[PDB]
Design an enzyme around this catalytic site. Sequence first.
Site, PDB file in Angstrom:
ATOM      1  N   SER A  62     -26.144  52.556 -29.225  1.00  0.00           N
ATOM      2  CA  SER A  62     -26.393  53.400 -30.420  1.00  0.00           C
ATOM      3  C   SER A  62     -27.212  52.651 -31.477  1.00  0.00           C
ATOM      4  CB  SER A  62     -25.115  53.913 -30.968  1.00  0.00           C
ATOM      5  OG  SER A  62     -24.496  54.734 -29.995  1.00  0.00           O
ATOM      6  N   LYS A  65     -30.542  54.139 -32.396  1.00  0.00           N
ATOM      7  CA  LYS A  65     -30.611  55.178 -33.460  1.00  0.00           C
ATOM      8  C   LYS A  65     -31.306  54.636 -34.715  1.00  0.00           C
ATOM      9  CE  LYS A  65     -26.661  57.274 -31.354  1.00  0.00           C
ATOM     10  NZ  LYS A  65     -25.226  57.605 -31.376  1.00  0.00           N
ATOM     11  N   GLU A 270     -25.138  52.214 -41.755  1.00  0.00           N
ATOM     12  CA  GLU A 270     -23.877  52.375 -42.527  1.00  0.00           C
ATOM     13  C   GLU A 270     -23.691  51.080 -43.324  1.00  0.00           C
ATOM     14  OE1 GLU A 270     -21.020  53.052 -39.351  1.00  0.00           O
ATOM     15  OE2 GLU A 270     -22.235  54.614 -38.420  1.00  0.00           O
ATOM     16  N   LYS A 313     -24.751  48.327 -37.722  1.00  0.00           N
ATOM     17  CA  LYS A 313     -24.626  49.403 -36.715  1.00  0.00           C
ATOM     18  C   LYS A 313     -24.005  48.832 -35.438  1.00  0.00           C
ATOM     19  CE  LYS A 313     -24.825  53.542 -35.242  1.00  0.00           C
ATOM     20  NZ  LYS A 313     -23.634  53.231 -34.415  1.00  0.00           N
ATOM     21  N   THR A 314     -23.018  49.509 -34.862  1.00  0.00           N
ATOM     22  CA  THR A 314     -22.474  49.140 -33.531  1.00  0.00           C
ATOM     23  C   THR A 314     -23.287  49.850 -32.449  1.00  0.00           C
ATOM     24  OG1 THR A 314     -20.880  50.906 -33.508  1.00  0.00           O
ATOM     25  CG2 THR A 314     -20.121  48.732 -34.356  1.00  0.00           C
ATOM     26  N   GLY A 315     -23.119  49.419 -31.206  1.00  0.00           N
ATOM     27  CA  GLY A 315     -23.845  49.959 -30.047  1.00  0.00           C
ATOM     28  C   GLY A 315     -23.155  49.561 -28.762  1.00  0.00           C
ATOM     29  N   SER A 316     -22.955  50.518 -27.863  1.00  0.00           N
ATOM     30  CA  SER A 316     -22.239  50.305 -26.592  1.00  0.00           C
ATOM     31  C   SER A 316     -22.880  51.135 -25.480  1.00  0.00           C
ATOM     32  CB  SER A 316     -20.790  50.640 -26.763  1.00  0.00           C
ATOM     33  OG  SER A 316     -20.221  49.914 -27.848  1.00  0.00           O
TER      34      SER A 316
END
Length: 360
Positions: A62, A65, A270, A313-316
Amino acid sequence: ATQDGIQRTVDAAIRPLMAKDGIHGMAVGIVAGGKAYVYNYGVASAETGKPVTRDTLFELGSISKTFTATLASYAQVSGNLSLSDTTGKYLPVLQGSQFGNVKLINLGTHTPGGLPLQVPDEIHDNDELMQYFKAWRPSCVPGACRTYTNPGIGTLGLITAKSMGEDFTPLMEQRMFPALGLKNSYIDVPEARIPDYAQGYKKDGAPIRMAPGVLSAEAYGVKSTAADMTRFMQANMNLLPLDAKLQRAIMQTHTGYFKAGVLTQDLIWEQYAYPVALKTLLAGNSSAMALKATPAVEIKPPLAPRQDVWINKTGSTNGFGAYVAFVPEKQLGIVMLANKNFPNDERVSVAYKILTALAG
């Protein structure tokens, strides 16, 4: 020497994290005093023992994004679109429908009035997607309801593409990545670079890499290196002299649009008041913020970009975990890239532990 002092902190968080969670390979990008350092750990692939190197590609999930958000921001600054515009204007298929009256800003901030996390399995192409959207009805208040969604930001990607008479993937690979100076960043990994593509691992230890799908390029499809993302962080702290418009586009993704729990929602980014407490970051990056329709308050006017924030931002993916956090007023940042989808709580903790030690 400066590099050696930073390495000692970064090693002391990362070795134990990887031992504990059985993460095969990590690439960690640090920005400190505006300089890029990159630290590599373990193996790209456990099966062959290829080590993680400068050129090793991880799935951003993510975090993709933020690239989408950046491209929409650029199209805004260029006068290709306004974020006040409706989807209808750009996908006339949808003019007259309810979704056709959702504003672009709501797509880039997860506030469209209720949308699923994932594109549902029954939608197989953009045409079946357009149909689903024609059928769509809001299930909460647009601009007062935060529902984290791939199709939302995805569809902002598609609309950004249309606004600039060009397909999304090429816009990104041929204008954005080159304009940001990212030469190891791909939606479609070239055949020549497939040896560089680290092996992802599921919770059980089985090898896997991401599957393409509807709006995947726009939502979770980017692969990149710690070096590339480290340069992305430098760009996102206004540290690289680029063309005025791209520079304004990047910093205007940081505009604060909605307050949702302990979190300020920007254009995908965020942000939290700096200095920031661990418990604040953990609550803002909870699964509940990710899974649940959360109350959102429009900021009037929108909060200008600010230095004094922790922007993350996180991402997986099935095989990968990633986390970007940076602090513009400190020229300070971390990107962690792992070939395991290891818990977000640990990503946020380790980032918190490392950037806190580096702040002094």
